[PDB]
Structure formats: structure tokens, C-alpha cells
Amino acid sequence: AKRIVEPFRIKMVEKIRVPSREEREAALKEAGYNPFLLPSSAVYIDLLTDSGTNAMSDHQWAAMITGDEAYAGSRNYYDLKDKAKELFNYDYIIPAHQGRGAENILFPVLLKYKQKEGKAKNPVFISNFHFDTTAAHVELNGCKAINIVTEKAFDSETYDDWKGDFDIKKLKENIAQHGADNIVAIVSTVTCNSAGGQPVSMSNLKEVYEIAKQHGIFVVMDSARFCENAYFIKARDPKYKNATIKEVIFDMYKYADALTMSAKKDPLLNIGGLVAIRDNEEIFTLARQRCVPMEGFVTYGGLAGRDMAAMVQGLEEGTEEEYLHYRIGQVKYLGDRLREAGIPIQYPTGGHAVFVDCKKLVPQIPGDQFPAQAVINALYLESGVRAVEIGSFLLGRDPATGEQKHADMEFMRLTIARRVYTNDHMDYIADALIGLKEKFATLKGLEFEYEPPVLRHFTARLKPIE
Amino acid sequence: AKRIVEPFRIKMVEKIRVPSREEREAALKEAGYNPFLLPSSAVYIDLLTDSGTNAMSDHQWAAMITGDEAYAGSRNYYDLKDKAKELFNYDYIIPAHQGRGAENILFPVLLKYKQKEGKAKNPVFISNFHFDTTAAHVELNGCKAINIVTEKAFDSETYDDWKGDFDIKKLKENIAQHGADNIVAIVSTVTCNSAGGQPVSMSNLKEVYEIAKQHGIFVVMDSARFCENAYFIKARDPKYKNATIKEVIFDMYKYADALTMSAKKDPLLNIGGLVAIRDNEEIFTLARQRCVPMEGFVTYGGLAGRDMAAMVQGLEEGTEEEYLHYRIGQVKYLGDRLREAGIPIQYPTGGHAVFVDCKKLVPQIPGDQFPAQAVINALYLESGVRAVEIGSFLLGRDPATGEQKHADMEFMRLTIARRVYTNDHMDYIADALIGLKEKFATLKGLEFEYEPPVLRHFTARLKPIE
Amino acid sequence: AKRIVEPFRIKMVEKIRVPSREEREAALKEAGYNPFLLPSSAVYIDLLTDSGTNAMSDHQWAAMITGDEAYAGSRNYYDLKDKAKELFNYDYIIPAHQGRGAENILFPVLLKYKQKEGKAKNPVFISNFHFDTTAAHVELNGCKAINIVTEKAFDSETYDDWKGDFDIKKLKENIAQHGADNIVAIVSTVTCNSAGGQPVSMSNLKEVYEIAKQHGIFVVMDSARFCENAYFIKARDPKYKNATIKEVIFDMYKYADALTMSAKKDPLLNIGGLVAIRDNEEIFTLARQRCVPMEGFVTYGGLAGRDMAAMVQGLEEGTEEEYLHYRIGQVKYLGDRLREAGIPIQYPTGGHAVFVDCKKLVPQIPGDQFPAQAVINALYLESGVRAVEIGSFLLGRDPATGEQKHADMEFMRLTIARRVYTNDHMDYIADALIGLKEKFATLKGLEFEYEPPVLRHFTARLKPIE
Amino acid sequence: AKRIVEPFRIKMVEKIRVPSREEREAALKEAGYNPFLLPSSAVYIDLLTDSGTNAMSDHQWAAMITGDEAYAGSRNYYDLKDKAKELFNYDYIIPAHQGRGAENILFPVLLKYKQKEGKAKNPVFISNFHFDTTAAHVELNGCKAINIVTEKAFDSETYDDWKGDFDIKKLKENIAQHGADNIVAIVSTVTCNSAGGQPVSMSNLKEVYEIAKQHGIFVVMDSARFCENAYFIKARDPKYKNATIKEVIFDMYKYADALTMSAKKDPLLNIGGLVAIRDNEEIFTLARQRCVPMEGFVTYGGLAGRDMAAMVQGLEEGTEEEYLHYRIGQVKYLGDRLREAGIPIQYPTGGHAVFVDCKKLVPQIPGDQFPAQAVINALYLESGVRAVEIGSFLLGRDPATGEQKHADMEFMRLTIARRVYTNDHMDYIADALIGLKEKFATLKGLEFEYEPPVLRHFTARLKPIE
């Protein structure tokens, strides 16, 4: 395990505390054995998500203070429009309040646009893997969310460079089974969050786009963690060895027609989303007509002017190679510390988190009882670190059958906010989990006490299968 | 015309600038003759809205700096929860990124809740007046938006205390005509924005609620400008002459079951919304289930932690009677300056804006050609002041007939942001509009160059009728 | 009286309140009848000074957030050095924590420098007027403070363009009496604070410098309010009718060898000072050696890096003619309001304050009993407005005599912070003082209960003569 | 070497860069081979000082935003007064712009007070060790600075609990040698900066105060690092094993009559100083009379209101034992890493810096040629880390004899700012210095090119002896 020094120094700090063990037990019972329902005051190191918890730079804060809060035609909107043209070479932008707001702008528009001429009677979205919020909007509009990640992602301990790649074989098969007229869009997720933050190769993005161009299929790039994806392409593809991160980003988006990005990830923000469209003005026009009643006027889209300002700066900082090397190198440090101690993880580590394979860790719990959730609750009661589940819990139920969706991966996600915690914080996390090697065989799963029909894991209250 | 001194002093300033005449004409021609499509760099004094353009206090910025950005269980969420219990005596809250996000959470829930028990076969919403964003969500969910403001709101020059009241006769008539089973909810808009920011009396709110309870009808208080309504109740109702503003607010929300608040208005914010529910835990649970995929997790709802922190402080500052007296007095001062010169305005002035009766100002333009928009474009080219139309342009087309909704009033709204402009800015505005007396009879209407199907006035490009 | 609109809008506010008459009476008795010993909570509108109470822009606060706090070689130091070369064409800078710190760096160096040749046996300083802090450091170093302001400054009600000019005849008479070898330096105060913030003409500055170089006398420009002086030169000197404010400034500092500036005035700061030297590198090195033990290291001078960054921005905002026209126009508006009611004031009003001639307002109080202080205490008890006296109280005792220095003027100074109060605040100030027109003849003077030896008026406790 | 995790997380960052080798060699030759003359742009990790470079909390920045910038009676002044009464039990305070301003306020007042009855003909100050600016002010007022640190401070490698203790035998001998009437004050520096940031025991502080009150000698506590001293007392004195830090601080100041403090150290600020007096009102009044000419009015003393607000919060956070444990543990970690590699340091490590004994590192260079400075220049040219010399260079020449004062230690100080750098940054510093283990015999020494008469090390340019 190698530590990479921060390419920055601390300018402002925020106090954290370790709750007593009795506090954590009472807090978990009141939270229905769901860490999502814990208050932040009962959490020490918060690994629930890397979304909106990032630490901003002084230039980001300075940009916020001078932000133009005008309702129509904010100066920061035009700075954002020129920034997207610089990075992605896309000509149209629509700001959104965060990622699921961006999808709520674009996805229904893409469905109605595909439904012209009376086609797409059984519409489907195809992705390497739809994340929970992305798949929810696909199904909330009456479509099927098809995930076709490469099989090499399911072998957790075997190394591969591109565990987030599309399964090109499955892609052509789904196109032949449903027909191009029923395929609303192909959603390229970079990095593939459900597969473990694993990257997608350039040649995979190119081949997927060329196949979609053959059938006249619209391609959207789910761009929450595109900078971390670009870093891996520079690191693992010999073709981009002497290329800048921006040069890699510029080539990635030659293989998409639009993007839906959650600026709360790689752009190093606490709030914010973005829709950008390459050249289809009709799709841009329809998406604007939906942005107004749902998010807000088309030049702020549910964001304060200061947040568009912070986004303009954060989009530049998120692509800085020295930062990406430390950020991804820190996650690699936490994974290597666990891997060297015998904890099975998704190898190699992704861009934003370490994914502990809880299939091998707690095999006595079936997947339908959420074994990864039992490990998370044990980690919290042991250390006050709060993690999140990426397995059968998050996958939810199939909207057609109403039963458990087939989960190939049962993961505990140790999500790392950007520029927030040090490698000494990582050692605390690793040493707390390593200290539970003799208690893994004792854990038992959870059963539902209150289950929401859509995105159940966020607010569900669980009961320990005691 | 009387000037009221600021109960505060200036701590931070932002430069404004007057664009040249040639700049304004070219910018308007570029904007399709729609000021919404103007950039802020081409606007001197921006009177387009009082939403999100407010100036915050030092305490509000201090609250933002220490805001908890935790994804789940933010410390500021619980502060926002205790604040709603303090102000409104409501037990449940759901933050939203702004007002239309709050209505997107609650309104479809209130429809599915009524439908589940075999009611709402032909669903309608009843309000003193639905605003353009509020009515859009009603029509998007397949309902009819019915506006029953008192007739006195149409007698613009004649003073009346409560030009925002429900027409109680029309309320009982619409209940019998449609059936209480088909009325999804009653929406009490305080203040009534479409009627000129005019207040609703306490006795009117009470009688409307009691009527709804006889028929089992849900009552939602559209609460964007609730503090300005509470001031008018204190200033004009003899029953609350010696009551605090908070006491008036506490009594106001005894006559609703839930509220949908755009915190970008009276809570003195640049972004933010809120859903608060009095005691219906079932409606609260369904609303949370919809909030998760549409806005965000239930403890931030598409808002950064700092913005919930500013909301808790702004909710307090917005209730201070000394501030409200200055704010509404500044609107009254601008209206008086125009009224002293013969400009027909909605008298008395509302809480947040001066509404110029362009029906009486430019009679030679029929309402179907947006006469108020002609006055706005003339005022902008003369002085660089951007105003917004509240008439046939904003009312749009009726969804059932596809034809122009009958507009009872053609208003130009001079919307005043809170704690931003001085009374010397007000003098510039008044002098500018007064200087267009000899050119009113020469103005002409506008045609559509591009008309959106939903919320057209935001992005429609216009053509001056030759 | 004419109101001038702000060339900006408000972005942040700070609450002020009016304490009751009861609170003010118990506060003044507690404060030894000296308003300087009053807490700010017992003060409504604070007119004590225009120093450090200004409101900054958003660009200023942004510069602070990205400020380089480095101990040696802060990035903002070199920006501050490049700014002085732009504005003043001076080659050397030394930051100081405020203006009196800048005088403590430079003035002792000039005395020792003059004493090398065996000169300065009876050292004196010559100025149009040393302010209380400038003269104090002169007398701390064993020198006499000689003030030779134009006689027209004592002609209160009679208009004159340049009531801050040097008396050229008295300048030549003092050079011949004491000898050029005994004159350590000439201090050009712009504007002349003790004459009422009145400006010095460019030709007067040019003549004083030509006389000084004729005798080898060092010229220091007291530059606390240099921008307000530059505005008056453009307004009243026809040679600079079509010149920018920066061009006027550039010509002003052709007639000086160095400057001591309190950045808490025209550079729109809450803290900060500056020493700048034209080209004499020996003085720069000698002043650097004293800066280190007294203020701090030579690249921050007892200032935080954020404050140097705000200084670089405020120096630019202080030269904008639109702002100066509004700022000085606001002082002119308050002065005109008092003058239109018969209140004798130093006419025309200066750049930063309105000076009420209390020698004409309250004739029944001898100069040794501080008549203006009686008017201030009366004005504070009436309205809660705090003001400051510029007469025999501030002038102090003659160090060689030990008795009262003769004062030719008895001023009450209504000092206006920059971009803090509106013209409506100005109306409150005037109306309060005008309401005292019947109680002026009944006021009595003040005598000393505790007198400091150095600068008595700041911490002295008084006793009203009954 | 044990790494101690941060009791906080990062909220804001600022970027740091590693310059190239040629840039560092170009910058060092341009800086006159004096790191004090390097621009911060040419510095990677800055170990020059721990003064004013600290990172603030979110609470501290929030306090700045609501700071009262009133000239007289700022609310933050009264908060600072109550804070000093809480922490130190002292009844009087005077804010200063920084530590050397606090000494310029109090030290000349103590000299004239001691000379009140014509005594103190040969005045002296006695301390465990006067730091450079403190001794400079002692000697600027015609006094001798007597340092009597325990001789166990001169044995670098041998551990001792209290290497900052007064040599009690030399204290009593100095009292008899000079007479109590010549001893203006005794200065207890906590921690003792010149001895390596080493602590002073509670028993030592108690005995020095008892001996002083026996002779009627005023005792001033140089309190720049009083929290770090209070931590060591709790850590090493078994008497305070179960006491809080505040209880240790409260007991420390029973053994002084006043304090001078640079708030730029333990109170975690970027600017600020403080004078506090236990109960001597006459000295307080005399100190106020000097603050006004030199620093500013007595309720701000050369500080912006926001900086007094930051000081009230910083004085609280500086006493938090969890933070002090991590802070001092981080310095111990850097020292242990160097000590484990055979590099001599002042053992044990002090509170704020690792002191590398260059007398044992480069015995080839005599102390008169500043051997530690050659090591500093070598470390910077190798890694971009800037350190400071504390040896014969810092000590200076005798203001009497004009030759260099005897230095019993030649240190290279690796000063660590508070909450700014991670333990990974320490590894960079350690590995960089360890990598020079071979070039120590190559080092060269320095000779002056320009020497200031007071505090030479700051601005002196020097020629390499090679």
C-alpha cells in the first residue's frame, strides 16, 4: 500500500467526532437498521457517498461569492456554456439542480422523441449498468432498464483493465431482440458505478457509439465520474499515455450525442447537475420546454447563480491530473490495505470507492437477505463509519415480475468524498474493518419492515433476521 | 409618496451598469423581443422577478459557511424541521430545490391519494389564483386549474383591503358543479401573485378551510409570499392589530393541511423550496417516496446543506415586522410615484411588486397581442429596466380548447427583490416609466415567432406586429 | 437637495436598531459623556468615522478568500507592489496595518535621515494640516507640527473650490524662519481632513513640491482620501475636465516623494495601511528596517494576506468616477439638507463628511469647553446617532506649553462610511439635527474628569458643566 | 513513528505546486540565498513559520462574516474581553494587530512605570528566553534582555520533561546582581520558542512568580503558544493527569500579572495579537494611552472586527485537547521519523516545530558562518521546502558590543502551521531531508552582503562562502 501526498494544503477544517458505542447502537435501532436514516451527528467518517460531500477550493468559493444570481441570463450560465464547449465540444447546455434532475429533463424527452412515427411501443434503455436513480427514471416513464456490463466485472478478485465495459455481444443481441425502433437511448455510464467505479475503455465507447450510429440510436453519456474515467484511460490505454486528461475527455465525447452529469461528483461540488447536447437542436429545444416546469428557467435550472459559478471552476479542477492521481491513488490505498489483509474487494479499485465483496465475506447470508447490509451495520456499530450497500438491496425489484432483481454482485461501498479525508482517515476505516475478521461468520441478514415501491433502500426500515 | 428608511445598513455591494441604447435594441432583437432571453449584462435594474434575487444578511452567509453537507441526516435538516414546527405548527417537512419542485412532489401525491379511493375521476384544483408554474403542474397531471379570485381584483384603481380573497360564492358553486370527490385540493396562494401580490384575509382563509373540511377537501397553502400576507393582515385586520407577525402566521396555517413554499421569495434566499405537512403521516410518506427520485434524498431534497442553513435563518428574518414594513413600503413608494403621475396601477400595491394596468395604459392593443409586453419592451429600450408580463402572455392557452385563456387583467409587473435596491433606484424606475407618456398610444402588439406548448412566456420568441 | 442613485445594488445587509432614549442616557453617563466609550449596540447610525467601517464589494471578498497568507513573499504583496506602480508610479511599497502604523514606519526614518548631515537641530514638520494621529507621531519624535492651511478654510459659509490648499506665503515664511535644514518633511494631506475634507488643487500641490525641491525638502503625501481629492480636481479644475480619475491621480503623485496611506478610507477597506516611496531606495531600506520590529515582515506589514488582496481590489474600486460621484454626492446631499435649514456647515461639503460649524451654532460655549462636543451629545441623546468632534477637544495641548492648543474652528463631523448608508439614512440624520434648532442656545460645555496626555479625545471622560 | 488521525475533516483546500529544480536554483540565487526573500510561488511546503499560516475552522470564518466593524465598542471586543476573563481570569484586555504590537504597547509602559520613582537606572528584562522580536523591543527601549533557560535545553539528544524551564539559580543570582529595582519585568515565554518550543512546568512557572512577588517584580507571560504548553503540562506533570486543558491554562496564569500574545499561533489565526492584564488598572490605563497612537483605538487595536471575532472562536478551538493531541503528535511524528534515521533533533520535539541540530550535522562550518542556513538552502534546492534558521544568524549582535551574541545551539527549525499539512506532507519533508545524508560534509557556509542593524536575518542578502 502506497500513500500519495496531497497536491494541496488545508485551508478550512470541519470538526468530526466519534460517537460512543452506546450512542451508535441506539441510533441504528432508531434508524430502522438503515444507515440512511442515521443523523450525521451519529456518524464519524461518512462513507455513504461521494456525491455533494466534496471539499471545494478557495477559487471555487471565491467564484460563488461573485456569482450572478440573475433569474434570466446569468453571466455564470454563459461561462458554463463555454466551459462545456471547451471540454466536450457540445454546443447546447441546460443546467439542472443535480443528476436525477438532469435525467428527468432528458429521458422523457428522448422517449417522446423516439415515440414519434408510432414506434417504440415497448421502449427500452440499454446501459453497461443503470444506477439506481437512472434506472428509476427509465422505469418511471414505462421503459425497461437493461444492464449489459462485461462479465469480467463479476469476477471480483481477477484483475482486468476495463471492468466497466459494455458487453458488445449482449449489445447486438438486445438490438436484435427488441429492435432499434424500441431502443430509446444507450446510456454510457463513466465510470460504471454499479460495477465498482470501474472504467470504460475508449475503444469500448467508440464501438458502442458506432453500433448505435448504425441503427440511428441516441447515445447519452452518464457523466458523473467522467474525469476519473479519463484518468484510467490515460493510465491503462497505451494510446493515451502522453495525452492530457482534457485530450482524453475530448475523445470520450466524440462517442456520445448528449450527456447527463451529476456535478456533485467529479466537478467537486455540493450541488449541481448538467445536461449538454452535441448538436441536436430539436432535442435541446424539447428538453428546454421540460426544464422550465420541472427544474426552473433554462439559464439556471434550479441552481443558484453561485453554484453555476462553482461548477465552472470545479469542471476545470476535476480534470487536473495531479489531483486525479492523488484522489484515485487514495482509494487505491484503502483497497490495497484491505486486500493485503485478506478482505476481498473489487480488484482493481475504482475511481471513487472501494467495493468490499460481501459474497465471499459473509457467505452464510443469502443475497435476498442483503449480506452487504449486515456488514455495514456491523462496521458502523464497531467504528462509527457509515457505508452504503450496492447489491440486492439497491437493485430493488423488477417492475414486471415484482420480485427480487437478480444481483450478480453483493457489495459494501466505501465511498470516498473528494479532498475531504486523509490517508490517516483511510487507515482508521481499514483497521476497523480488518478488526471484524472473526465476526463475519456470526452476522445474519435483514428483513423488510417498511418497503417503498421505488428506490426502496433510501428510506426502508429493516429488521434483523435474528 | 413616502420613503421608509432601511432597518439595516449595507455590508456588501455588487456593481450594476446601464447599457447603451444601441446595445439594448440589438439585445432585444437578438432575444426575439422577449426580455427573458436577454443576458443580465444587458440589464441595468432587473425587475423581472423577486425570486432568488434577494440580498442575504451576514447571519445567512454565516449559516451557509457552517452548513452540514452530509447526504443523509444533515444537521440543518433537523433545524429546518424544528423551524417549521415553530412557524406553522406542522410536524413533517420535505425540502425541495425550489417552489415548482415542491409542487411536483405534493400535487401528484394528492391526485394519486384521491384516486386510490375511487374519487378524482374528473379531477380539478381550486385556488384563488394558480400561478403559471402551479397551474402547469395541475395541467401536467391531467387536472383542470380553476381560479376564483374576488371580483375586486379586477377593479384595479379602486382601493380594497383584500384583493386576493377567494370568491366564496364561486367556491361553493365549483364544489357543487364538479363534486367534492373531483376536487383534488384547494390551493390558497398567499399573497395572490396573479392578482397583484394582493393579500388574503384571515377570515377568508378560515371560511375557505371550513368549507373544505365540510367536503373532505385537502387544502394546500401556496406559501411563497406568506410573510407579506401576514403583514397585511396585521396592518388591515383589526383583530390582529396588537399581534406579532409570527402570531399572524401561526393563525394563518390553522386553515391549511400542507404548504408548498418557494423559499426564494419571503425567506430571503437565492434558491430553495419546502413542503410541510400538518399531521397527515400517510401523505407525508407518499410525498417522501416521490421526493427521492425527483429531487434527492429526504433530508436535503436537491438543496445543498448550506442552503437549508440559510433557509432556517431566512425564515426568521422574513418574519421581522420592521423589515416587512420597509420592504412593502418600498413597493408602496414606487407605486405611489407612478400613481401620482396618473399611471394606472393595482391599488393598493401588493407586497412584492407594482402591477401597472396595461389594459388601461395601452387600449389600442387587444389583450390577445399582449399589450403589457409592448409596454415592457418600450420601458426596457428606454432605460434598460427589465420587467415581466402578467396577462395573456403568461396565462397561455387553455389545454382543453388549445385557445387563448381569457385574461381578465393585463399587468406589467415591476417586481422588487428584497433588500437589494434603494428608493433612489425606485425613483429611476418611476421617472423612466413616466417618461413614456407621449409614446403609449403609439405602441403595438406582438406576434409569435416560436411558441412553446407549456409555459410559453419563458422562452417564446416574438415578432412586433407591423 | 439632490439625491444621486447608487452605481451598484445591495448584496449583503447588516441589521441596525434604534436604542431607546432610556438606554442612551444610561449609556452616556456610563461612557463618561464621551461617545468614543459607547458600545456599538447603543448606537443606531454610526457617524463616528469613515475609517474601517466601509462596505466592500463582492470582488473584494472574493480576493480575500483566495488570499495568500504566506509569511514571506505573499502573492498579494507583489500585486500590491504592481498596483502602486500603476496608480502612483512609485517603485517601492511597505504594507502597514493601518495609517498610523504607516506613519510610525516612515516619519522616524525621515527624522534620522535629516539628522545625518548634522541638520534637524530644531526639527519641524510642515503640512496644510496634520490630523490628530499624524501630528501625534510628529510630536512623539520630538518635533513640532506646523499647520498652514489656506485662510479660506476658516470662512465657513463662503464657497471656495480649494479650502484645503496650502498657504504658499506661509509656506515660504516658515521655510525662512526655521531653515530648510530643520524641515524634516512637508506633508500634503489629500484631502485636508482637518479643514473639512476639503480638496487641494493640482496647481497648489505642484507649487508646494516645486518649492520643496528648491530647498531639498522631502514631500510625503498623506493619501487616506486621495481619490476623493482626485474627483474634486476633475470637478473644479478645468485643466482636468476630460481626464480620467487615474490620470488625475498620476499627476497628483508627480508632486511627492512618498506617501503614507490609511487604506481604511478611499481603498474601501476595514483594515490596512500602506507606505509607498517614489525612487529613494535608501529611505525604502531604512523604512524596511523599522517595519520589521514594529508592524511585521516587509511583505505583509502586520496585515493578513486576505487584507492585502482586498487592498489591491479596493484601490481599483476607489478610483471609479461613477462611485466617487455617488459617494461625494451623498455627502453633498446631507450637507445641502442641513444648509437649506439654516445649519452652518463648512460649505461646500468635503468628500467624506459634513462638518457643522459649532462656533456659529452654539456661541454660548467657549472653545476650551468644546461646544461641538455638547452638540454631539445632544444629537446622540435625541436620535442615537454617534458623531465626532473636530475642534479644541481633538486638537489637544501644546507639548511645549502644556495648555490648550488654539483652535480656529469648532466642527462637529458627521462622517459617512463608504457604500454603507442610503440617502434615506441621510434624511434621518438631518431631520434629527434640524429638530434641535430650538435647544441649541441651552447647551453647555464639557470639562475634564480624566485627561490622557497623548490623544485625549479618544479615552477622556468628561463632566458637563452645570 | 506513530501517525495521529485528524480530529477533523477538510472543508476547503488551496493548491500547492512543486517548482522545478532550475526554478528553485534561480529563485534562491535571486533571493540572495535567503529563503525569506523567496516568493511563495517558488515554495512547495512552507515551514518558515507557524505564525499566521494556520487553517481556520468553518466556525471561525462564520464569526468573521458577522464581525462588527465599528470603530468604537465593537460587539466582538466585548466578546474578547469576556473570553480572556474566562480563560485567564484577567480583567483587562487591549487588542493588538499582532504579537510584536502587543509588546510595543506593554513593554515601554512597564519601563516608565518601573522608572516612576527615579529607579531602574540600568533596566533589564529577565526571561527563560526572549524571542527575536521580544528582545528587539526590550533593546529598543534601552534595556538588556537576559535569557536564563535551563541548561538541560543545551543537551539536544538527552530527553527532559521541561527544557523551557527558568534556571531558578540563575534567576535569583540575576536578581541579586542587578537589584530588583532594575528588573522591569520577568517574561515567561510559554512555550519557550528559542529552546525548541519546549514547555515550562507548572512548578517552574509557580516558583518564578513566587520569587518575583517576593521582590515586587512584574511578571508578563509571552503567551503565543500557551495551549501547547498547557498540553505538555497535562501530559508530563502527573499532578494534571486528570485535568482539562482549560484547568491547566487557568492555573498557568495564576503565575503572571499580564500577558502578551501573538494570536497568529495557538488561537489559530492569520493575524492578531492581545494584551491582557490581571488586575493592575494603572498599568492598563497607561497601556491604553500608548495603544491609540501606535496600534489604533482601544476596542480594536489595529484589528478588523472580523479578526477579533475569529480570535474569540480561535481561543476556544486552540484549547481542545483532541486537536492539541493531533497537532503536537504531528510534530512528534516528523521528529521521530528524522530521529529514527539518525538525524539529530532537539529531543523531545516541541509543540510547533522540529528543531534539527545542525551543530551536529555540519560541524565543519563555525557558528559565525551560520551552518544551519547552509542546510536549509540545500533542503530547498532539493525539494522546494522552505525552513528557517534559529542559531547565530537569528540571535544577532549585541546592541551593546556590536558583535554576535553567544549561541549555545544552532537549529534548523521545521515550523508546522496548524491544521494545514497532512502526515503525508511530513513524510515528504522527512524523506527529502533524509535523502541529503551524504551531502552534509559538502555544505559551505554563508557570509554577509547586506546586514540590517536590527533583526538582520529577515532582509539580509548573503554571498555563498564557496
Ligand SMILES: Cc1ncc(COP(=O)(O)O)c(/C=[NH+]/[C-](C[C@H]2C(=O)Nc3ccccc32)C(=O)O)c1O
Ligand atoms: C452514475 C450516476 N448517475 C446519476 C446519479 C444521480 O445523480 P444525483 O441526482 O446528483 O445524485 C448518480 C448518483 N449516484 C450517487 C448518489 C445517490 C444516488 O443517486 N444513488 C445513491 C445510492 C447510494 C448512495 C448515494 C446515492 C452515488 O453514487 O452515491 C450516479 O452515480
Ligand SMILES: Cc1ncc(COP(=O)(O)O)c(/C=[NH+]/[C-](C[C@H]2C(=O)Nc3ccccc32)C(=O)O)c1O
Ligand atoms: C405563488 C408561487 N408559487 C410557486 C412559484 C414557483 O416557485 P419557484 O419554482 O421557486 O419559482 C412561484 C413562483 N413565482 C415566480 C418565479 C417564476 C415562476 O414560477 N413564474 C415566473 C414568471 C415570471 C418571472 C419569474 C417566475 C415569480 O413571481 O417571479 C409563485 O409565485
Ligand SMILES: Cc1ncc(COP(=O)(O)O)c(/C=[NH+]/[C-](C[C@H]2C(=O)Nc3ccccc32)C(=O)O)c1O
Ligand atoms: C488624514 C489621515 N491620516 C492618517 C490617519 C490615520 O490612519 P489610521 O491609523 O488608519 O487611523 C487618519 C485617520 N483619520 C481618522 C481615523 C481616526 C484617527 O486616526 N483620528 C480620529 C479622530 C476621530 C475619529 C476617528 C479617528 C478619521 O478621519 O476618522 C487620517 O484622517
Ligand SMILES: Cc1ncc(COP(=O)(O)O)c(/C=[NH+]/[C-](C[C@H]2C(=O)Nc3ccccc32)C(=O)O)c1O
Ligand atoms: C514567542 C513569541 N513572541 C512574540 C512573537 C511575535 O509575535 P508576532 O508579531 O505576531 O509575530 C513571536 C513570533 N514568533 C515567530 C514569528 C516571526 C517573529 O516574530 N520572529 C520570527 C523569526 C523567524 C520566523 C518567523 C518569525 C515565529 O516563531 O515564527 C514569538 O514566537
Ligand SMILES: [K+]
Ligand atoms: K451536499
Ligand SMILES: [K+]
Ligand atoms: K438565484
Ligand SMILES: [K+]
Ligand atoms: K474596522
Ligand SMILES: [K+]
Ligand atoms: K498571515
